[PDB]
Amino acid sequence: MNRQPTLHKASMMGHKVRVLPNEKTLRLHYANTGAYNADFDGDEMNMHFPQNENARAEALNLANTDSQYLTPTSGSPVRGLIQDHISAGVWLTSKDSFFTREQYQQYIYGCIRPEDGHTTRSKIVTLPPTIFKPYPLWTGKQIITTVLLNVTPPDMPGINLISKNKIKNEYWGKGSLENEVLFKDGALLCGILDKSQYGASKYGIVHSLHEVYGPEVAAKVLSVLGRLFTNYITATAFTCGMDD
Amino acid sequence: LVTEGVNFQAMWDQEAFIDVDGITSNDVAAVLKTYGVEAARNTIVNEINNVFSRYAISVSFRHLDLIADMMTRQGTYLAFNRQGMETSTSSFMKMSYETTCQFLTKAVLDNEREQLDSPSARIVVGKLNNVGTGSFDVLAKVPNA
Amino acid sequence: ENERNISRLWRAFRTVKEMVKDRGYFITQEEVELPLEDFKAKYCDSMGRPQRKMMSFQANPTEESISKFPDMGSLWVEFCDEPSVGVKTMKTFVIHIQEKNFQTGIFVYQNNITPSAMKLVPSIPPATIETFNEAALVVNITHHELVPKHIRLSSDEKRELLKRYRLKESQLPRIQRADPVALYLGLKRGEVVKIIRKSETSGRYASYRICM
Amino acid sequence: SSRHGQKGVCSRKWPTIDMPFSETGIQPDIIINPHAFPSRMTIGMFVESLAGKAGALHGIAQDSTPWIFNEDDTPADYFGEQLAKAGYNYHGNEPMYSGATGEELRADIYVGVVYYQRLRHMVNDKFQVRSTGPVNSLTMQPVKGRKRHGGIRVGEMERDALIGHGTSFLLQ
Amino acid sequence: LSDGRTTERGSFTATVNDERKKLVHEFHKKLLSRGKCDNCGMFSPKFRK
Amino acid sequence: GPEDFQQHEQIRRKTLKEKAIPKDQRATTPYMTKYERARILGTRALQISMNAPVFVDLEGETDPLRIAMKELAEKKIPLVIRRYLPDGSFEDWSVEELIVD
Amino acid sequence: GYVKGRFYSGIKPQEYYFHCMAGREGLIDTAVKTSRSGYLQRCLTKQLEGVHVSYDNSIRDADGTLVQFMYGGDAIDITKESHMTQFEFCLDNYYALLKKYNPSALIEHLDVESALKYSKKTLKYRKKHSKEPHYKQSVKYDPVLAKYNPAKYLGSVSENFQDKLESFLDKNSKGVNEKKFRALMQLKYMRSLINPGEAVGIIASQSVGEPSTQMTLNTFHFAGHGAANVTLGIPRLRE
Amino acid sequence: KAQGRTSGKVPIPGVKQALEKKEGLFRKHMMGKRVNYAARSVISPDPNIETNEIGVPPVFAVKLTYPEPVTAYNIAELRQAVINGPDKWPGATQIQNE
Amino acid sequence: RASCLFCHHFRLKSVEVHRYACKLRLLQYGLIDESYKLDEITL
RNA sequence: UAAAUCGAGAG
DNA sequence: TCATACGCCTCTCTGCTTATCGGTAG
DNA sequence: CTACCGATAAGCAGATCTCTCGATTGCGTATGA
């Protein structure tokens, strides 16, 4: 799948095919747009179909989109969610967001479908609420934590990552520590997940997940996060207006 | 202290004011002529990097090192054009590049036999490439009698 | 003006001394780390004349250099007192090269050289006569930060390198015979040099070039 | 496209039920992502949406010739007064509910009416597919052109990117 | 040929190609330079195009 | 049947034998490169599709590439990789000695 | 041209005209730059299309002429270089990285002692001779990468990477000991090596050409008085 | 190199002109060729594909084919494809004999 | 040009063309050093 | 079914 | 008188290459 | 004195991603009708 002009390697990868029986446009996920340098814009791009087993096995392995997470220009990552998934993550990972048991379970199953192979374990496992009484209340950071804990393969420790994001501590109030993203044993405990975590940002959560669990787990995490922030954005939509 | 021209031998006399050991020049040809090929490669890398740095774009030094080494592969300040291209074993690559007529006569006058090594020649003759998955063969272990 | 000329002469003398020491002949730190006062005391007349007749010397190889290159022989450094290059003045040194059986000779001229000498420098093989300029030796090029360290490789090391990388002599990166460091090292054609580049991503790493 | 250079291909025909209905029952016929605005700074679209909403509410036509409003007669205030008089939100927002979950959205959604033009670049004049069709004569390669059932071209850049991967069999 | 530095087909690399090209160019320039053919000492007519 | 072909065959085999690097002195990467893995998988898939015998349990699999990946996981691929050095010499590694990832 | 208006309250007619001027210049430059970079990228890739990493870890052209003995001097992939300096991150996820790498199964086909011994000897030699001038530093022990294959000898790492690892292990005194962490990171360096057959020349040409398409985004005009005023950007690349 | 032209319309290109420029034979017919089995269309987003797949329209899915050779394991799937035919996806368009 | 119509040789000296031919023959097999070492056989 | 020139466009 | 085949009918960059005016040895 | 060797002055030659549409195609002349 190629778009012109092909200025580098990433502008021509090999995608698996999903036959969507609706209309006549090539439908592309949202992470690839950063590498392909296209907008859904009237933009057009070719789709070549290799016709022998060597080319099949060599576009599935050497030219596949998973292997092109980092561009060779400087080693910086090139994939990641782009525009509204970032805002959805900023709103969901803020400590002002609490979810009941039903909302928590629905948000988890909306992206960790075990029938398609999204999660390794055959049973979706959840977390105890952050507020036991008066009534249970989870958190968006708990949503991220259990998403990671479900996609991450078992018999392996979590991600111990310490990073930062672009929103200063003064924006969240006084005495706040939301500028420092902290992962401990695979559980998100501080800071929000803005563009600096998933996207064209170095040493983020997705970059660390890639470097620890291989590129396939990073791709799965990217897809799952994009699906989760999509389902969260329908329930609590993001809007801009004249008052802003 | 920066100047607006290149002449090293003049500042060599002014050792009292100027430390002659750290005289680095923007120009590459003069550096090659007065300091050697390796200094030319170093200044090529530095000049090709400082333009990227000024634009806040990061390019790993392996790419620039490879470019400089390819540019000074004959001990001379070569370039990426037909005037610094004719020194190549494979002719089909140059003919595909440009001036197909001129490079054809220069290859047919001396009966230049080419071994189909560059990707351009292999593409012309329709052979499997030599870079990547084509840099080796594959054999089969047949258990006969 | 004579003070500046003497300073340039002393800098050229020190550069020649360092060049010979790098080439691999027995030169101690004496006569190399010679201060300007010592230079005026020894290589200067009652007025301050350069007296380049007295600064000519013969350099002998070290024991380690002899072991490395058995064919290496003695060298002679000649300073031209005549402002230009004279045919007879250069011919005297040229004939003395084989009169004393000198394998190598170094010539330092002031301004320019007659082009009959250019046809005459390769007249006594295998003895090599390498010519230099007084204004070109004011600053040692190898001392520059940009210039890496060049080490000539013996026949054994060159053969080992070629066998290890399965190369032909012509497939290595080339260094010009007129390169300023090639003249410094006195590299013959076919002699592989070793370069230790201070890479930005690997610190020290060794690269090889062949003189051709 | 709108009248402010906001391009975009239609993505999906969102069913009316899944469309986010408003308090009054109006389900918008076109959804534009809010992220398109910060980079292009087309605040004219924001002004036009609420101006048109006020015009449709009051049954009047609002003029929009440049340089009628100034820094003391801001159009946002001018049409927000009309919206408030009609009884809607002064900032053009509208209480909206998600059509899939039925619960009220987190914030007040910005709604209005804007003039929209359908461009002539339909997808029926841009899509091609070739398995095996007519070929050339002196090169035996597929012909050029969509109307001729011809193949697409992979150029020097595409070949370089195909060998940049190390993929030799893909190139072949 | 005996010690293995070159086979009977001849070794052809970039630097030997460059040296051969330079030698041939200099040979042509020297050929076109001097008249008065020294094999027999006779001037020859000058061609033009 | 001339000796003008026997001599050519003999010299060809002599040159090929002098080209081969003995197993005791090959000095390349013991790991299997990504290109080598991809080419091995593709060639094995081609052979399987062309009705070559298989050694793994075909647990309801129809993709020759998937069968090749399963064989590579079980290290039962009967293929030998001839890594080529720039001069022309080659070392005959096989998939068994080569270790993946 | 200094317009005091804003896109929320609108811009006056003269400010509108000036902003139209600026937008037109921006669009003209955007149109020009894309065509400008194409010839540079094409020439670079046409010349460098053949040079590739060989099985000696020395990169060279298609015919065989050597360009570099080691890719950048270290032969490590730029893509996999990302987390070779993050010693804190590697120490934190030691257990996950060890499960990923499995040093137990990477022993029967590896040599561990010779490269490590030579690396220690060379490191002590450089530390003893560090306070020496660049030209006077006579080479007695070449870098370990020169002799021992980094893809077959554990511990044959770069001088920069080894220096950084030793400095980190000395400054940061932490169940993981320094020995196991050093072994894990040496295995990480071994696995983070560029594979033979990489189209390094194509990669270099693309990585030098494509970033030049993002040129003139930052203008930084030479507003200084009597400055260098050296040519900048695509013209400088062309020269 | 041709000589002689007063007004003319277009000077017939020589065999050299057929191999020289960017539109010549080399740069237009071996350094890059038109390809069979390839499609092109407009792209539209889809956050419901697994970040590594492509949304192939059914119009493309009925024209682009792959030559799968029949085997013991492929017989059922390919028999079903042949029965479905060239119009009902998944299906087959040709059966290349031995 | 650069040819003689009378003796039917080049206008160069036979010794010079022989030296050039020897240099080119040496460069044919790749003896890039012996070609330069051949110049000092003026005697 | 072609081939060239010019004109209008999309990314 | 008058139609289709034959005969043509003026605002960018890098080198390389040739010719021509100065100089040195013999 | 004069030929070989250079050192400009001028001219010459070669350069400066894909895709979709539409339109168009010479005067000039000279003899058998």
Ligand SMILES: Nc1ncnc2c1ncn2[C@@H]1O[C@H](COP(=O)(O)CP(=O)(O)OP(=O)(O)O)[C@@H](O)[C@H]1O
């Ligand atoms: N001459 C050219 N060559 C290659 N691509 C071109 C081009 N002219 C236009 N394009 C394409 O036009 C599109 C414009 O996109 P860009 O301007 O680079 C990102 P943007 O500025 O953020 O757009 P936005 O303001 O709509 O958000 C690109 O996809 C580019 O490929």
Ligand SMILES: [Mg+2]
């Ligand atoms: Mg686009």
Ligand SMILES: [Zn+2]
């Ligand atoms: Zn004659």
